[PDB]
């Protein structure tokens, strides 16, 4: 339900203002990152829309294409997304994740199984209109089985909205579940992820907790963490995002800077796409679900001007 993100409107609000800063910045010899990630974070993207905006119509410039020609690395990633206005994030995010060889069936997950309806319709509707394609299409070449369909499902938007309580039904569906979840989720695959993909979340959290009591535990139990194959990984992505979203998205950071190296890609998607809907609850449940400051940790995994911006958008200290 309600949530807060990490970024909000600023105030004063004055895009010409913001536009020569950014320009004067940027212009000249030298290039001043510290003004313009100040800039780009303390501001929302229907802000660094407009500062755009304003920053062409006195210029005769690109802002965008200006940030790319003076910023490189991952700062410059970083802040040539938060630019990327917020409509076309997903689609965009999808697109160079099916373009090419190589497909990133990870993205793919993420995005479909947290994103709501009129998220998805909106997905769907850019996809269109600006690549002029079909998400599903471009998504059902690249993907292939169970795990087509359950993309497929999804992509519908279609999810049973809440409401009453069907005993017998979330009764059903756990036994339904349960049974092809001891069959390592390969038995009647066509079932569960009718169940997993269209049921209703407040449906879905009850079957969760009685499938608890049928089998004495989590349903997240059966499908294994790392291995697996796509369709575990995406099952286990809708799961999560049934439970609590923001404990998906603390989860997926988390597993971005443990261990070898970092996901720098994921950690720019997470705290981007999420930075104006509920990253302030992510960092909240990141604490509460690993005994661990979440900001702390990109403090301790990046540096630079890239962190600089990232610790910004996670909320300060
Ligand atoms: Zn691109
Ligand atoms: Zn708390």
């Known amino acids: 339900k309600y949530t807060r993100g990490t970024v909000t409107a600023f105030s004063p609000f004055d895009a010409r203002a ?46 965008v294409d200006d940030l790319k020609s ?8 970083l802040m040539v997304s938060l630019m990327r206005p917020a409509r076309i994030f997903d689609a965009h995010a999808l697109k160079h ?37 079909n998400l599903e299409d471009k998504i059902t070449g690249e993907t292939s089985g169970h795990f087509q369909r359950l993309l497929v499902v999804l992509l519908q938007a279609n999810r049973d909205p809440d409401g009453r309580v069907d005993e017998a039904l979330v009764e059903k569906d756990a036994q339904v579940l349960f049974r092809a979840g001891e069959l390592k989720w390969g038995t009647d695959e066509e079932t569960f992820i009718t169940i997993l993909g269209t049921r209703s979340v407040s449906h879905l959290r009850r079957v969760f907790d009685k499938y608890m009591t049928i089998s004495g535990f989590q349903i997240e139990e059966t499908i294994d963490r790392e291995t697996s194959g ?3 990984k995406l099952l286990l992505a809708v799961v999560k995002c049934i439970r609590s979203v923001p404990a998906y998205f603390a989860e997926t950071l988390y597993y971005s800077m443990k261990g070898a190296g970092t996901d720098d890609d ?26 661990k400051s979440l900001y702390q940790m990109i403090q301790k995994d990046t540096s630079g001007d890239y962190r600089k911006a990232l610790l910004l958008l996670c909320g300060g200290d």
């Open 97 to 133: 994740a099916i373009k090419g060889a190589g497909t990133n069936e990870k993205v793919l997950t993420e995005i479909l199984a947290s994103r709501t309806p009129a998220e998805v319709q909106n997905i769907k509707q850019v996809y269109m209109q600006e690549y002029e394609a």
């Open 70 to 77: 003076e910023l490189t690395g991952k700062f410059e990633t």
């Open 18 to 63: 913001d536009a020569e800063a950014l320009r004067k910045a940027m212009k000249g010899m030298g290039t001043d990152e510290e003004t313009i990630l100040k800039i780009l974070t303390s501001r929302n993207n229907a802000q660094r829309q407009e500062i755009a905006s304003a920053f062409k119509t006195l210029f005769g410039r690109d802002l």
């Open 230 to 232: 796509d369709l575990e």
């Open 266 to 291: 994921t950690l720019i998607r997470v705290m981007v796409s999420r930075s104006e809907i509920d990253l302030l609850d992510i960092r909240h449940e990141f604490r509460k679900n690993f005994a």
